[PDB]
Design a protein around this ligand. Sequence first.
Ligand code: JHI
Ligand code: MG
Ligand code: ZN
Length: 313
Amino acid sequence: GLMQFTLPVRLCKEIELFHFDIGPFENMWPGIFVYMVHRSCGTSCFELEKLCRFIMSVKKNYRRVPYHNWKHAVTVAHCMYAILQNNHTLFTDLERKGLLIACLCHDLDHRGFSNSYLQKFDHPLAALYSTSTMEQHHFSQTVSILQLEGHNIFSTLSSSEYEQVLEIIRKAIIATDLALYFGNRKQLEEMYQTGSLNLNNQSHRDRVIGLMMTACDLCSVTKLWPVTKLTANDIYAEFWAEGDEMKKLGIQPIPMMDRDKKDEVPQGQLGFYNAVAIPCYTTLTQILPPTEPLLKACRDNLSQWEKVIRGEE
Ligand SMILES: Cc1nc2c(N3CCCC3)cc(Cl)nn2c1C
Ligand SMILES: [Mg+2]
Ligand SMILES: [Zn+2]
């Protein structure tokens, strides 16, 4: 009951910042996450014994893939923590509870392949879920782990609070399907620019939580350049594997996923920052002003990719 998780001084300080890297010590990530829940939500949102057993089951159900791994899960959860801490009063007791869990769980049991690859390979998951294939599977894995004995961290909620939190987590996880991001952001642009945007409108909150999830999910583009650059390796290692598997199915993969076209990476980062990242953190900063650091870091790293092309690194 009186057991405050504390971190070494540098982490204690650095963790509050958007650009925090959680480090190479796997065995500290669970304590980083519990620390984040306690400061975000309260020391009493969750029975500690249930929380810990949930975290270790979630961890076990992430695979040893180069990017879509347990490190990713905790990285996206920490970005959500930074957003929630710099916007204290805008979110309910339940949204704070559900969104960190949503982020930790958001890529559960990912195999390192796009929804696109499942559809062309004709994976059973693509017959069970026609759109947002992996994302419906991720949510489905969350519920499975929540129903393991001694793993219901939401046990103390009412019947209707429990249903509310599982619906926050479902929409939060579906929103990480980047196919849905584009429309979601355009609608948020329009609504904020005409003044229609209203945070008491539940369907408007949903869109804003949706955009936060894209932002946290893409947060590797908002790090110090050496972190961004080294994560890009892990990211491309999956794409090139998936490209290999597309070729095995007798299909030329998009150049992004083609490991013969490594030369084109810097320009592909350009495309991505201009088409996806900058628009994402631009619209997010308009809706949620204290998140500007994400936009500024994203801009700084775009500038760093421009420099790679110009042969200045
Ligand atoms: C975080 C991040 N995500 C991507 C990404 N995708 C998002 C998921 C599907 C495509 C594409 C590219 Cl080219 N870079 N990139 C980065 C840096
Ligand atoms: Mg995903
Ligand atoms: Zn993700």
